[PDB]
């Protein structure tokens, strides 16, 4: 309902918590070339020696990818050089962080939500990531950072954030009561701070309820973590088809090298073994190319995750929709298999109304503009309020400033501006 | 495994035989391929010393032996990444120098030697 | 299309994308930036431009006393954009290349 | 006799074809309702015709 | 062999276009639905709308 003397201003608010899931890395893998193509047969190897350094190129490519994975993980998580820890007393002003902080009652000190996330991801294939070795020259390597170290990094980040604010990302951590930190966070988005101190436990209750509903939505629904799951799926499928390409003919007589060797003479078995090795070489090259492309995608995602960790968590963002929908207040990280999960806490208004407005007020041949806020009228009187929460105040000379006469502004009304010194001088 | 009377072989998801029945006595045998892996050399630059350590990755070194001197030389230390030979296990934890894996790093320090330890994330601090 | 070179049609026609864009335009010019954070809240246009001016560091004073000058400049700039598009053809290269 | 090459090719091309629609939706569909302007174009003196 | 070459080049081009689409989405989120302080992100000068 547009019109040129009408505005709508909110009167209440709501605190919301949302989740965001990003992949970070994938499985490292290595392949033996001479054993995959034709293993245990020396005759074949002498034929293979006529192609040169193909196997070396394949190995170099796979090694490059393997290293880049660990680089990604360290870029994303290792952004603090000290390991902070929360005190044993939990007087946080009414907020209840019990569901995201560590639980020492477990072999691995993970929180409740991290346990949920680690139980939701299921892998169909078994033993395709102490044994790790596949059927034919295929091996999987273990990552450099165990799943028990990442949890310590996440715990350090959380404790620092809730005990020191954003000051531990620019220097040495400086403590501060949580309520005052939240007051500053409101001050950052254009709402005066006395709106928090007078509405504190309401905000605490809303935050707790939001966390509870997050727990339910994670523990009930199953299709939340698709982005992380399909990565595992694609990797398993690619490896499966690689192994499956060993039972084809490619035009030769048989797919078993021993049967070709033990049924023909060396002047004819060569023409068959050549076909076989050609086909298998082509299969290997296709595999490595696809792996390179997927690695590029994952690197892009990891860079995005690192940027979000730097700006949403260690500070407070102004970029719109970067750190969740609404006005950003803060964020918390959590770990998950092969990726990370952010919980964004944000601010949304509600209960808007209707008022009539004006750009200026001609008092005594002078035009008065509002310092910070906007003029409103409830029907008979004129007040000046802040733009993001309805709270009216009398119009005085301390919250307005003068500039020129009042015959140039379009749509200027008359009203009186009360002078605080006028009664102090008149009553005197 | 419980074969039916008329079945002989057994196959896997990728169609690789992994069980057989002995023709002369009717019993079931499970097949497992014998071990393999790559070899890795951990070295500080040749500008510093000509001494090295060897990693057999993915192998339980109850059968390492099958150069040989670095097959029973001065230790056989088992780690989740494989068997490490030529490096000595300490109990302290420092910053990572050369990454071995699964949380284990290695470095060259004191009469000098090569040591393998568990990397440390950082100092501890209470605010 | 002769040996199997089929082409599929996009899911969103060209008459839905235009409607989305018109929705964005109307929201922007009737409610400011408030509709990207919650429910759309209305406000006159001159006051919204005053807010933006105050945003870049100039006092809002400056706008209300020079409103029609700014309006004229904006209209003329739009006209020039229209002419420049209607005249030259090499403007959309980045698209054509695809 | 060459195995599963054609299935791989078809799968790749289908993946690309779906990704295109994902791109378009992510760019344009950021609004939840369909607003519209009043018939009285009193926008303070500017023009959006 | 011809088909393999074709599909590979198509995959690379698709990746490039996806990068461009993400950039466009970010511009829509930040320059249109708000007012930006990043320099030269939404045109040369001080951004208004
Ligand atoms: C917005 O710009 C239009 C552009 O033409 C102007 O209105 C024109 O209307 C017709 C063409 O539609 C033309 O013959 C007239 O002479 C005007 O130029 C006008 O500047 C403004 N529109 C309105 C309604 O004020
Ligand atoms: C908008 O301004 C015009 C200009 O005088 C005025 O006639 C009109 O009444 C104003 N809007 C409303 C809803 O009155
Ligand atoms: C704001 O909403 C809460 C419930 O969400 C309600 O109890 C409170 O009264 C509302 N504010 C006002 C001023 O009524
Ligand atoms: C935090 O929430 C949990 C979950 O209900 C509750 O058991 C716990 O008591 C709460 N914290 C405090 C200090 O009561
Ligand atoms: C403001 O007034 C218009 C005009 O009738 C009305 O449609 C609208 O609902 C009012 N605002 C609210 C928040 O009700
Ligand atoms: C709000 O409007 C009513 C309507 O006349 C008026 O009586 C009242 O004084 C206004 N508000 C205040 C705080 O005076
Ligand atoms: C009050 O405002 C009106 C405009 O409606 C104007 O004509 C009048 O001059 C103003 N008051 C005085 C004392 O001038
Ligand atoms: C480390 O200390 C423990 C005692 O806490 C001891 O049992 C263990 O053997 C030590 N490890 C080494 C490598 O000396």
Swiss-Prot record, chain A:
Region Fusion peptide 1: start-end pairs: 111-129
Q: Where is this site: Cleavage?
A: 110-111
- Effect ascribed to mutating residue 381 to Y: In strain: Theta/P.3
Q: What does the UniProt entry list as the effect of changing residue 398 to H?
A: In strain: Alpha/B.1.1.7
The SS bond pairs are 33-55, 38-44, 312-323, 362-406
Per the UniProt entry, the effect of residue 168 to L is: In strain: Eta/B.1.525
Phenotype upon changing residue 59 to K? In strain: Omicron/BA.1, Omicron/BA.2, Omicron/BA.2.12.1, Omicron/BA.2.75, Omicron/BA.4, Omicron/BA.5, Omicron/BQ.1.1, Omicron/XBB.1.5, Omicron/EG.5.1
Biological function? Precursor of the fusion protein processed in the biosynthesis of the S protein and the formation of virus particle. Mediates fusion of the virion and cellular membranes by functioning as a class I viral fusion protein. Contains two viral fusion peptides that are unmasked after cleavage. The S2/S2' cleavage occurs during virus entry at the cell membrane by host TMPRSS2 or during endocytosis by host CSTL.
Report what the protein is called: Spike protein S2
User: Which organism is the protein's source?
Assistant: Severe acute respiratory syndrome coronavirus 2 (2019-nCoV)
UniProtKB/Swiss-Prot annotation, chain B:
Q: Give the positions annotated as glycosylation sites.
A: 47, 60, 91, 110
Its domain of life? Viruses
| Effect recorded for residue 57 to H | In strain: A23.1
Q: What is the effect of changing residue 107 to A?
A: No effect on O-glycosylation by host GALNT1
- State what changing residue 110 to A does: Partial loss of O-glycosylation by host GALNT1
Disulphide bridges, residue numbers:
61-83, 96-105
Function of the molecule: Attaches the virion to the cell membrane by interacting with host receptor, initiating the infection. The major receptor is host ACE2. When S2/S2' has been cleaved, binding to the receptor triggers direct fusion at the cell membrane. When S2/S2' has not been cleaved, binding to the receptor results in internalization of the virus by endocytosis using host TFRC and GRM2 and leading to fusion of the virion membrane with the host endosomal membrane. Alternatively, may use NRP1/NRP2 and integrin as entry receptors.
Listed under subunit, the entry gives: Binds to host ACE2. RBD also interacts with the N-linked glycan on 'Asn-90' of ACE2. Cleavage of S generates a polybasic C-terminal sequence on S1 that binds to host Neuropilin-1 (NRP1) and Neuropilin-2 (NRP2) receptors. Interacts with host integrin alpha-5/beta-1 (ITGA5:ITGB1) and with ACE2 in complex with integrin alpha-5/beta-1 (ITGA5:ITGB1). May interact via cytoplasmic c-terminus with M protein. May interact (via N-terminus) with host bilirubin and biliverdin, thereby preventing antibody binding to the SARS-CoV-2 spike NTD via an allosteric mechanism.
Identification of the protein by name: Spike protein S1
> What organism does this protein naturally occur in?
Severe acute respiratory syndrome coronavirus 2
What is the primary gene name for this protein? S
Shown chain mapped onto the complete sequence = 557 to 705 of 1273
């Amino acid at each position: 309902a547009y019109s040129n003397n009408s505005i709508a201003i909110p009167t209440n608010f709501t605190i919301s918590v949302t989740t965001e899931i990003l992949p970070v890395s994938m499985t490292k893998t290595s392949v033996d070339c001479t054993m995959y193509i034709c293993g245990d047969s020396t005759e074949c190897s002498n034929l293979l020696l006529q192609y040169g350094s193909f196997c070396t190129q394949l190995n170099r490519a796979l090694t490059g990818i393997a290293v880049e994975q660990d680089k990604n993980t360290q870029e994303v998580f290792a952004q603090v050089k000290q390991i902070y820890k929360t005190p044993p007393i939990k007087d946080f002003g009414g907020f209840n962080f019990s569901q995201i902080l560590p639980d020492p009652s477990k072999p691995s000190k993970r929180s409740f939500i991290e346990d949920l996330l680690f139980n939701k991801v299921t892998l169909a294939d078994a033993g395709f990531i102490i044994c790790a070795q596949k059927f034919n020259g295929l091996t999987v390597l273990p990552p450099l950072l165990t799943d028990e170290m990442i949890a310590q990094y996440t715990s350090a980040l959380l404790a620092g954030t809730i005990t020191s604010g954003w000051t531990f990302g620019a220097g040495a951590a400086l403590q501060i009561p949580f309520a005052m930190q939240m007051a500053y966070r409101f001050n950052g988005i254009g709402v005066t701070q006395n709106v928090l101190y007078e509405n504190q436990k309401l905000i605490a209750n809303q935050f707790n309820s939001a966390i509870g509903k997050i727990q339910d939505s994670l523990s009930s629904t199953a299709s939340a973590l698709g982005k992380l799951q399909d990565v595992v799926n694609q990797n398993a499928q690619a490896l499966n088809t690689l192994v499956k390409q060993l039972s084809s003919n490619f035009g030769a007589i048989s797919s078993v090298l021993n049967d070709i060797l033990s049924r023909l003479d060396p002047p004819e078995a060569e023409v068959q073994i050549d076909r076989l090795i050609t086909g298998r070489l082509q299969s290997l090259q296709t595999y490595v190319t696809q792996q390179l492309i997927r690695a590029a995608e994952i690197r892009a995602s990891a860079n995005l995750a690192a940027t979000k960790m730097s700006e949403c968590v260690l500070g407070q963002s102004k970029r719109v929709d970067f750190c969740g929908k609404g006005y950003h207040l803060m964020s918390f990280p959590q770990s998950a298999p092969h990726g990370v999960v952010f919980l964004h806490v944000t601010y949304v208004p509600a209960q808007e109304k209707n008022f009539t407005t004006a750009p200026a007020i001609c008092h005594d041949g002078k035009a008065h503009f509002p310092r910070e806020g906007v003029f409103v009228s409830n029907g008979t009187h004129w007040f000046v309020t802040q733009r993001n929460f309805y709270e009216p105040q009398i119009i005085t000379t301390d919250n307005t400033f003068v500039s020129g006469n009042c015959d140039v502004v379009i749509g200027i009304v008359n009203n009186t501006v009360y002078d605080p010194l006028q009664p102090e001088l008149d009553s005197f | 495994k419980k074969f039916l009377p008329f079945q002989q072989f057994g196959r896997d998801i990728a169609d690789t035989t992994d069980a057989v029945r002995d023709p002369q006595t009717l019993e079931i045998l499970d097949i497992t391929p014998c071990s393999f892996g790559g070899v890795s050399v951990i070295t500080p630059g040749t500008n510093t010393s000509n001494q090295v350590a060897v990693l057999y990755q993915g192998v339980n070194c109850t059968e390492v032996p099958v150069w040989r001197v670095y097959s029973t030389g001065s230790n056989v230390f088992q780690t989740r990444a494989g068997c490490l030979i030529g490096a000595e296990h300490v109990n302290n934890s420092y910053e990572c120098d050369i990454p071995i894996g699964a949380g284990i790093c290695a470095s060259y320090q004191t009469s000098q030697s090569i040591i393998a330890y568990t990397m440390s994330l950082g100092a501890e601090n209470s605010v």
